[PDB]
């Protein structure tokens, strides 16, 4: 994808020429946010996201896009809030919970709510070595209450299918 400053500028101008209505431009803001994010315009991307919400609020796709943008930026709290809003709106995609658990594991939070969220994400996705290592580190930093849930999840995974070499190594460690 050959993209540059002038390339994003002419993309934006061509998208503006492809819309002769303010509400149509606001609806096309889900792409304008990505264009501004690529051109390094976080405030303009947030404004485009708000404009697209003002015309089509309460939708899982827009909330997931906003959460992904916040996660790539660094606003972990904003991403967690957006994912929670998307979950309370319609918990159809477990990717929101997966990213919430990933952010919690990267932030290292010792709390019962964090442990419950990690357990829920593990029950959702039993695979993925990245999230496995994340939840293992989290439940090891926790204590015995988290180690019991980790052992239960490992036993359930082993009963469902043969475990992995790294999984067995981490369990023995």
């Amino acid at each position: 994808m050959r993209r540059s400053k002038a390339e994003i500028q002419r993309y934006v101008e061509n998208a503006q020429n492809s819309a002769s209505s303010p509400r149509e431009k606001s609806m096309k803001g889900f792409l304008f946010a990505r264009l501004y994010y690529e051109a390094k315009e976080y405030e303009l991307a947030k404004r485009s996201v708000s404009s697209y919400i003002s015309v089509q609020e309460r939708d899982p796709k827009a909330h997931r896009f906003l959460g992904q943008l916040f996660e790539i930026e660094g606003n972990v709290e904003k991403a967690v809030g957006c994912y929670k809003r998307s979950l309370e709106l319609n918990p159809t995609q477990k990717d929101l919970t997966l990213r919430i658990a990933e952010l919690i594991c990267t932030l290292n939070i010792k709390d019962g709510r964090a442990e419950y969220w990690v357990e829920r994400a593990s029950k959702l996705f039993p695979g993925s070595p990245e999230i496995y290592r994340l939840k293992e580190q989290l439940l090891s930093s926790q204590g015995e209450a988290g180690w019991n849930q980790l052992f239960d999840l490992i036993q359930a995974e082993l009963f469902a299918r043969p475990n992995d070499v790294y999984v067995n190594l981490k369990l023995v460690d």
Partner: protein, 294 residues
């Protein structure tokens, strides 16, 4: 005038009379000419806040119906530009909510939907008395809304665009607060169990049938109390297959969902102060074009 809140405000089929039913204890109908307005009718006979309203066709009889928070059904008839008394019913388990007539393809059968636990259908036959159809043990908590369904929709029966006249029998849907949706069809000379479904465990606000004038696809867009929406689509023959699919969900209190007069634009009104006006595009999908503020 209308100093208090205004509920529904319908217009005549030609664009002259404007019937606005509000809670201001006054129903004023003005005129539409030269962009102005002149008061021409002042009706008042309810005991509580007036809610919904529905018009009719002058070829079958200029008759209006008004529901209020008093368990009373009020009906007026138009003669020489003056509306007088017609049919006045009173007494129910709860206050009447929804009220609408069947389309012109059937007749002038009124539907009464309220959280009373039963269904009371009023049928206007002849030029005087009426008939009452009572259906009990059909709602645990009660009804909520009733949306009629014409037989001129090719999406229900694949035999209309073939020089064949379909049956003109009564068919509609219902989605009360009994955690169950249901379909009603006038078969075996009465009403019984046709098709029920379970898709919620609380309250459901209203529903909207698509009055397609040339679209061979029958759709129904629902709206619940917790922002839940269901789009039941059908395009088969004889028996239909309602698919409980989802579209744009909400978390507030979605209230009304209304289809256009020719099944072109859907208007959804709830607690977001925005009425998303959807429309079927040429690619067989949905797209929103215009909005409005509340």
């Amino acid at each position: 005038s209308h100093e208090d809140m205004i509920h529904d405000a319908q217009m005549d089929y030609y664009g002259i009379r404007l019937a606005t039913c509000s809670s201001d204890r006054s129903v004023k109908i003005f005129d539409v000419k030269n962009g102005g307005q002149i008061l021409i009718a002042d009706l008042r006979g309810h005991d509580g806040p007036v809610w919904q309203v529905a018009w009719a066709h002058p070829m079958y009889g200029n008759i209006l119906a008004s529901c209020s928070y008093d368990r009373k059904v009020i009906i007026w008839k138009e003669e020489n530009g003056t509306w007088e008394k017609t049919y006045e019913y009173t007494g129910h388990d709860s206050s009447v909510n929804s009220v609408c007539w069947a389309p012109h393809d059937f007749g002038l059968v009124l539907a009464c939907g309220s959280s009373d636990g039963a269904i009371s259908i009023l049928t206007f036959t002849g030029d005087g008395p009426w008939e009452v159809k009572k259906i009990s043990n059909a709602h645990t908590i009660g009804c909520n809304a009733v949306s009629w369904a014409p037989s001129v929709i090719p999406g229900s029966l694949v035999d209309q665009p073939s020089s064949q006249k379909p049956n003109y029998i009564k068919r509609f849907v219902s989605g009360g607060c009994d955690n169950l949706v249901k379909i009603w069809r006038e078969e075996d000379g009465q009403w019984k169990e046709d098709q029920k479904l379970e898709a919620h465990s609380d309250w459901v606000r209203d529903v909207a049938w698509a009055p397609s004038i040339g679209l061979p696809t029958s759709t129904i867009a629902s709206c619940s109390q917790d922002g839940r929406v269901y789009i039941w689509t059908s395009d088969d023959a004889a028996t239909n297959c309602w698919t409980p699919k989802l579209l744009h969900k909400f978390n507030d209190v979605v209230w009304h969902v209304s289809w256009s007069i020719t099944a072109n634009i859907l208007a959804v009104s709830g607690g977001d102060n925005k009425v998303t006006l959807w429309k079927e595009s040429v690619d067989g999908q949905w797209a929103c074009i215009s909005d409005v503020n509340k």
